[PDB]
Design a protein around this ligand. Structure first.
Ligand SMILES: [Mg+2]
Ligand SMILES: [Mg+2]
Ligand SMILES: [Mg+2]
Ligand SMILES: [Mg+2]
Ligand SMILES: [Mg+2]
Ligand SMILES: [Mg+2]
Ligand SMILES: [Mg+2]
Ligand SMILES: [Mg+2]
Ligand SMILES: [Mg+2]
Ligand SMILES: [Mg+2]
Ligand SMILES: [Mg+2]
Ligand SMILES: [Mg+2]
Ligand SMILES: [Mg+2]
Ligand SMILES: [Mg+2]
Ligand SMILES: [Mg+2]
Ligand SMILES: [Mg+2]
Ligand SMILES: [Mg+2]
Ligand SMILES: [Mg+2]
Ligand SMILES: [Mg+2]
Ligand SMILES: [Mg+2]
Ligand SMILES: [Mg+2]
Ligand SMILES: [Mg+2]
Ligand SMILES: [Mg+2]
Ligand SMILES: [Mg+2]
Ligand SMILES: [Mg+2]
Ligand SMILES: [Mg+2]
Ligand SMILES: [Mg+2]
Ligand SMILES: [Mg+2]
Ligand SMILES: [Mg+2]
Ligand SMILES: [Mg+2]
Ligand SMILES: [Mg+2]
Ligand SMILES: [Mg+2]
Ligand SMILES: [Mg+2]
Ligand SMILES: [Mg+2]
Ligand SMILES: [Mg+2]
Ligand SMILES: [Mg+2]
Ligand SMILES: [Mg+2]
Ligand SMILES: [Mg+2]
Ligand SMILES: [Zn+2]
Lengths: 138, 83, 104, 208, 124
RNA sequence: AUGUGGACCCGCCCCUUGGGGUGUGUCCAAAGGGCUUUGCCCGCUUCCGGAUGGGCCCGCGUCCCAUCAGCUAGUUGGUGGGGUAAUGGCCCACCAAGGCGACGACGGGUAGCCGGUCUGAGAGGAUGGCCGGCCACAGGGGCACUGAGACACGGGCCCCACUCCUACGGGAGGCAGCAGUUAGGAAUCUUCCGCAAUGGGCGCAAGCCUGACGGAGCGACGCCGCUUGGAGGAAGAAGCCCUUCGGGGUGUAAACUCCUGAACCCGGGACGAAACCCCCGACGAGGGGACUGACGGUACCGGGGUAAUAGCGCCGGCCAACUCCGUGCCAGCAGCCGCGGUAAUACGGAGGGCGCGAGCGUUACCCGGAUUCACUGGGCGUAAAGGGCGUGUAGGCGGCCUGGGGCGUCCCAUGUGAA
């Protein structure tokens, strides 16, 4: 049993990209899917897809990196530089709308879940809604 | 009873009063019921008296009693002018 | 508004009176996490109507005694001795915490 | 003055001409020319690599001495320019330049700010018409700064507004040499001040 | 520590031990000398440091340093003390205010006059 | 006696805890005074409402010690009394055996609480001093009387401790009101003026009372404004200080030339004050009139007019500012690091320099830098830190899908958030 499945997906991604994998299977939950939706919209992933490993259902996540650099260590810049859980089990984090944080003067996002559904910060802000601050990504 | 009186607010040799409603038993500068005007006895500005006859008339109707120079000021703003 | 609380009857042991246990979540002022926290009310039960385990709304009211300042307003969910048992073990524990132990 | 004492010895410490003593500072006699090193016994020696603190100190001294203000008075302005909306650097310089004692020296009523201080403390100056003898008085825009009526023909303000015939006055001030009036049009645009002082450093000093 | 931990146990605030029980933690206590003495410094110093044991109004008997070139303190002098370690003499935590009460000023000093307690000498 | 009306028992209706009607019965009122005297003014009585003030109850918040872990017998609840304006073990009798605690009971320590203050980038930390609000207290401990209200600071009773009176029996006191004295202490003010203003009590009013208050007084205790001068003035006095013996420093500083004119003198001289009151009108609205200033001959205005106090700290690094002499691990300095053992920019003095300036230093305390109790914001292989190991109680935490509820969470409106 994963104690925090969301943290795990965020991590599975973090770990996958640092070795520049092509893709990574996370075991599948509606919620997780709803988050990748955002990642894919904002362009941190090339997109996700509901494969089906070994009997049970996953979300193959297709990753994205920069162009090959030059010098020593060509390895590309990461698109997902950084991706952290904010609220966690046993210390939940809920901002109201006046306190949704601004990630990197907007160069990054913060996914939060609201009663109008899973949204970025700019989205919640427009929609006039706060909620459980899920994570930040930049 | 509840009074309508002056509350001293300026500074040493710089008197400004707040015209106030309050139970007669407060200190003169303590917690009051409602400010309903102000008075600068030096007329240091064009705007040295100010009342709000509506509220002044309200408190009179429930039997606030104004001190002798509060009523003088109230009259001077035509609280009592009935014509 | 007279305050209205909802709770579990955890004591019948009195004449015309029930102990009612009332929880309340809330986020911790400094450290964030949501903390449970509970308090027992003595409530006025003049029909000795409500029984151990019943879940009752309790209402603010004019004093009946020391301690008794609430009356049992209505019955929400009848019977559920889990809560009573939960609460019951908590006081069972108490026995341990002292100066000795063993079989005590 | 407020400092009161050897003036061109500060000229030499800051290493810049400061023009505190009026018109002799234009003559080939101001010490800055043909004696440009600091005061004191060691003033002509190999000067050590000055610390980061030293440089921010001196630039503040450089500014404060040029205006003849104290320091408690100086700090109280900077802090007011801090709390004030806008660029706190050049909001400072505007307040400084709004001091009546300085505005009088800008309108060339006196050859220096110190001589301009005395004319104010001695009631030789009107603002909008009534006497103001407070050198710290803040000139606001719209205000008209006259020579005092019964002063107008002292031996000094005669020969000083005579020098101001044909001379030019800062962009932010008018001036009328006939009746000896002058107006404060606008707080100075930072460009208007030719101030030999990187006020960016002065902000940096008051934040240790 | 986990949040649940920090919720259960606290953090733990601190505690400034007062390096000078001038009991009343006032800024000066008056006291009477009981011993004038001389003390050896420590570590890599040598000299003869002047020192009085003082019995205080704060009900305390403590040892104070006697700052200055020379002093005038005897086994019954009444003195004002003021706090201030002497790095060399362990257990000397307070100074004696020179120029107050039985402790004379400091005979003929031109420089740091406020400390040591001597008036502005007269001159044209 | 009158009964508008109200109170109480019983009933009935509507409400819904003791709210509002209604019937019978019972019970319950009052005070006179003044006149510009038949009809006004000031009072009195009952009831209903308003306004102001308050009692009581509840949710939630409020420091340290667990080297305080168990506590409780009016204890917890019931019935019925008592008591009160009123709920209540508030108190009493009887009955049941409850109540409380690891979400910290009981005990100990410390503390008036808040608006706010200080610090901080913030989150935090610290604090409750002036002013404002609540509470409590009036030599210490009880208590009730009077009353709308008190269990009453300048009211009453008793007990205790002091001081005073005392004819030895007995009495009189209570500045934590304003001043003031003494004691303690590092340290904290005048036995001042005035009721002119504002406010309070009584009076129809005139007025009286008001150490509330409005002022003045002392202390650089804080803040703020201001002065000890301005312009000119040498290749650059004198003394003092260096020196490579040429020079260099203090230094435009002084002297000195001119200019202004703090102090001081003379003259005028306030605002704060227009009401109460009297007249007209009508004792209303409205108009007219008169009286009144502690501060004070002060503020300010005008006329004269003198070049008129500068101090304190620091100069090894951190930290702006270096030279000579004296001193010899001494005398001394010292926030920390460290100076001084005969060439000391660190001691003592001198010259010079730096920083502030009617102030500058010191001590003390608070927050800060201190992500050095880390929520923001830290750690534990060897730096301090994994429990010797397990078991598994409380508790914390919990996989994927659907539905209901809507506690947490979020949103809008609104009330509150006094000064
Ligand atoms: Mg040695
Ligand atoms: Mg040594
Ligand atoms: Mg020294
Ligand atoms: Mg009768
Ligand atoms: Mg106390
Ligand atoms: Mg911090
Ligand atoms: Mg006493
Ligand atoms: Mg008593
Ligand atoms: Mg009465
Ligand atoms: Mg009574
Ligand atoms: Mg009394
Ligand atoms: Mg009392
Ligand atoms: Mg008394
Ligand atoms: Mg007194
Ligand atoms: Mg004494
Ligand atoms: Mg006083
Ligand atoms: Mg009066
Ligand atoms: Mg007073
Ligand atoms: Mg007038
Ligand atoms: Mg009068
Ligand atoms: Mg240096
Ligand atoms: Mg030597
Ligand atoms: Mg030296
Ligand atoms: Mg030193
Ligand atoms: Mg000053
Ligand atoms: Mg901290
Ligand atoms: Mg520490
Ligand atoms: Mg942390
Ligand atoms: Mg650490
Ligand atoms: Mg080891
Ligand atoms: Mg170790
Ligand atoms: Mg182990
Ligand atoms: Mg071990
Ligand atoms: Mg479990
Ligand atoms: Mg779940
Ligand atoms: Mg659970
Ligand atoms: Mg909800
Ligand atoms: Mg609100
Ligand atoms: Zn010059």
């Amino acid at each position: 049993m994963l104690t925090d499945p969301i943290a795990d997906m965020l991590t599975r991604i973090r770990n996958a990209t640092r070795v520049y994998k092509e893709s990574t299977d996370v075991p599948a939950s509606r919620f997780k899917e709803e988050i990748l939706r955002i990642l894919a919209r904002e362009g941190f992933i090339k997109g996700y897809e509901r494969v089906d490993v070994d009997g049970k259902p996953y979300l193959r996540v297709y990753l994205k990196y920069g162009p090959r650099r030059q010098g020593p260590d060509p390895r590309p810049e990461q698109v997902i530089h950084h991706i952290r859980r904010i609220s966690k089990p046993g210390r939940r984090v809920y901002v109201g709308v006046k306190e949704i944080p601004r990630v990197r003067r907007g160069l990054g996002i913060a996914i939060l879940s609201t009663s109008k559904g899973v949204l970025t910060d700019r989205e919640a802000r427009k929609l006039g809604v706060g909620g459980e601050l899920i994570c930040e990504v930049w | 009873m509840v009074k309508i009186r002056l509350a001293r607010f300026g500074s040493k040799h710089n008197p400004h009063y707040r015209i106030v409603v309050t139970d007669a038993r407060r200190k003169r500068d303590g917690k009051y019921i409602e400010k309903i005007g102000y008075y600068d006895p030096r007329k240091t500005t064009p705007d040295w008296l100010k009342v709000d006859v509506e509220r002044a008339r309200y408190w009179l109707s429930v039997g606030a009693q104004p001190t002798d120079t509060a009523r003088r000021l109230l009259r001077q703003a035509g609280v009592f002018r009935q014509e | 508004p007279k305050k209205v609380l909802t709770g579990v009857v955890v004591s019948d042991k009195m004449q015309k009176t029930v102990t009612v246990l009332v929880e309340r979540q809330f986020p911790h002022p400094l450290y964030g996490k949501v903390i449970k926290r509970s308090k027992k009310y003595l409530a006025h039960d003049p029909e000795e109507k409500y029984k151990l385990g019943d879940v009752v709304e309790i209402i603010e009211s004019r004093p009946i005694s020391k301690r008794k300042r609430f009356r049992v307003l209505r019955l929400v969910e009848s019977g559920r001795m889990d809560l009573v048992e939960k609460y019951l073990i908590r006081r069972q524990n108490y026995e341990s915490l002292s100066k000795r132990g063993g079989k005590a | 003055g407020r400092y009161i004492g050897p003036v061109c010895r500060l000229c030499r410490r800051e290493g810049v001409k400061l023009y505190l003593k009026g018109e002799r500072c234009y003559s080939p006699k101001c010490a800055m020319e043909r004696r440009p090193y600091p005061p004191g016994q060691h003033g002509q020696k190999r000067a050590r690599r000055p610390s980061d603190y030293a440089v921010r100190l001196r630039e503040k001294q450089k500014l404060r001495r040029i205006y003849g203000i104290s320091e408690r008075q100086f700090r109280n302005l900077f802090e007011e320019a801090s709390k004030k909306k806008g660029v706190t650097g050049s909001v400072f310089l505007g307040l400084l330049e709004s001091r009546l004692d300085n505005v009088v020296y800008r309108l060339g009523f006196a050859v220096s700010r110190r001589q301009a201080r005395q004319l104010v403390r001695h009631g030789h100056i009107t603002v909008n018409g009534r006497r103001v003898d407070l050198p710290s008085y803040r000139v606001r825009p719209g205000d008209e700064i006259a020579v005092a009526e019964k002063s107008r023909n002292l031996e000094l303000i005669r020969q000083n507004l005579e020098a101001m015939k044909g001379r030019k006055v800062g962009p932010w001030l008018s001036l009328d040499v006939e009746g000896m009036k002058g107006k404060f049009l606008r707080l100075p645009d930072r460009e208007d001040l030719a101030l030999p002082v990187n006020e960016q450093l002065v902000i940096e000093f008051y934040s240790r | 520590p986990t949040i649940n931990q920090l919720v259960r146990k606290g953090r733990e605030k601190v505690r400034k031990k007062s390096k000078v029980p001038a009991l009343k933690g006032a800024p000066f206590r008056r006291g009477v000398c009981t011993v004038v003495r001389t003390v050896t410094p420590k570590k890599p110093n040598s000299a003869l440091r002047k020192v009085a044991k003082v019995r205080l109004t704060s009900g305390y008997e403590v040892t104070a340093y006697i700052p200055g070139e020379g002093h005038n303190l005897q086994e019954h002098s009444v003195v004002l003390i003021r706090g201030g370690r002497v790095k060399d003499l362990p257990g000397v935590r307070y100074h004696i205010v020179r120029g107050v009460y039985d402790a004379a000023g400091v005979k003929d000093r031109k420089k740091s006059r406020s400390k040591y307690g001597t008036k502005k000498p007269k001159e044209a």
